[PDB]
Amino acid sequence: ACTKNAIAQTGFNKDKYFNGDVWYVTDYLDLEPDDAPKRYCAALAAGTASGKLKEALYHYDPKTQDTFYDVSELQVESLGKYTANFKKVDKNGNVKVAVTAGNYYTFTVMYADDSSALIHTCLHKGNKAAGDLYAVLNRNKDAAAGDKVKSAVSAATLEFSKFISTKENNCAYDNDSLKSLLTK
Numbered sequence: 001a002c003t004k005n006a007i008a009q010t011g012f013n014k015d016k017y018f019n020g021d022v023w024y025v026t027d028y029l030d031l032e033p034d035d036a037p038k039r040y041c042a043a044l045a046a047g048t049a050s051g052k053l054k055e056a057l058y059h060y061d062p063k064t065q066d067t068f069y070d071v072s073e074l075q076v077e078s079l080g081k082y083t084a085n086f087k088k089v090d091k092n093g094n095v096k097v098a099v100t101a102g103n104y105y106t107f108t109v110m111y112a113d114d115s116s117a118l119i120h121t122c123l124h125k126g127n128k129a130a131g132d133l134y135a136v137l138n139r140n141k142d143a144a145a146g147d148k149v150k151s152a153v154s155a156a157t158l159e160f161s162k163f164i165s166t167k168e169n170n171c172a173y174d175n176d177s178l179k180s181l182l183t184k
């Protein structure tokens with residue numbers, strides 16, 4: 001089950017975060033034992049498309065090759081805290097699994113600057129358990145976590161040493177599909 005009421009960044013700059021560009025997950029922390037593989041690739045685009053706040057997600061397990069995209073419509077709960085639906089889509093935005101009640105995630109931006117961010121998400125999918133996830137993001141897929149984001153991890157009373165890096169997994173991303181999925 002999820003247990004964290006993540007606190008959004010003071011003074012969060014929504015237009016800078018939701019600028020239409022891509023964020024790569026460089027490190028992740030799942031608080032639920034065996035919720036996450038040990039090796040993963042994930043990225044997201046975030047932007048406003050025709051007045052609607054959107055995310056597009058990509059997940060890839062580099063061992064199994066399991067791959068899926070989602071597009072998400074975000075509703076605002078407060079500054080930097082959202083509830084997102086999700087429909088599963090192919091990389092061109094064709095619907096595979098429609099939006100349905102009880103498929104949603106919460107999404108909280110705990111820290112962000114122009115290049116890095118720390119987020120929390122609680123995924124609810126049907127009758128699946130939930131679970132908390134933290135992710136360190138960067139605009140550069142190859143960037144080591146720096147001092148602004150590692151300090152934010154400590155300020156959230158977390159240990160960065162507990163986070164699992166995605167860097168040793170040869171992750172390759174279709175940035176074009178993530179950007180175009182924002183419109184879908």
Ligand code: HEM
Pocket residue numbers: 025028035036037039040041042043044057059068069070086087088097104105107121123125133135
């Ligand atoms: C970047 C932030 C992330 C968000 C917002 C997020 C959101 C989601 C959503 C919405 C789904 C369900 C998709 C669908 O069924 O259509 C999902 C599934 C999944 N995510 Fe994430 N995810 C994120 C990052 C990650 C990371 C970094 C990992 C682990 C390394 C991870 C592991 C998983 C796994 C294993 C599933 C499959 C769950 C299942 O159906 O049994 N996710 N995620």
